[PDB]
UniProtKB/Swiss-Prot annotation:
Organism for this UniProt entry: Homo sapiens
Record-given protein name: Histone H2B type 1-J
The entry's keywords: Acetylation, ADP-ribosylation, Antibiotic, Antimicrobial, Chromosome, DNA-binding, Glycoprotein, Hydroxylation, Isopeptide bond, Methylation, Nucleosome core, Nucleus, Phosphoprotein, Ubl conjugation
N6-lactoyllysine found at: K16
Modified residues (N6,N6-dimethyllysine): K30
Keyword DNA-binding applies: yes
DNA sequence: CGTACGTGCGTTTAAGCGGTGCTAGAGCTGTCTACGACCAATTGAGCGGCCTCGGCACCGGGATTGTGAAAAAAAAAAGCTGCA
């Protein structure tokens, strides 16, 4: 096992900016996909 | 059914032409060095996997607020005059 490739994405940085501008609001996986 | 737009005319304008004179700056060359690629070593930021726990989808009951449809009233219009 331990495949799923390792696919890079901006989602940690998106979350990081989100917590700056709106610290109590989160984000669905589709919405993250669009970001 | 009313007039905005196409046609044609006379009047006016300035584009185009060709020419001249001047130079800003496009673009090329040579020099030199600050910067970015390249490399190996190192390791923590970010990856996948995994579990949890509350957001959010779904439910039922009733009040309330849009959202419109019909029915009822009000009005404007149509036809009819009876005098002066
Ligand atoms: Ca005229
Ligand atoms: Ca120059
Ligand atoms: Ca870590
Ligand atoms: Ca994850
Ligand atoms: Ca309901
Ligand atoms: Ca309404
Ligand atoms: Ca309505
Ligand atoms: K340089």
């Amino acid at each position: 096992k331990r495949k799923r490739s390792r696919k890079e994405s901006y989602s940690i940085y998106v979350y990081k900016v989100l917590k700056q501008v709106h610290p109590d609001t989160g984000i669905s996986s589709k919405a993250m996909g669009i970001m």
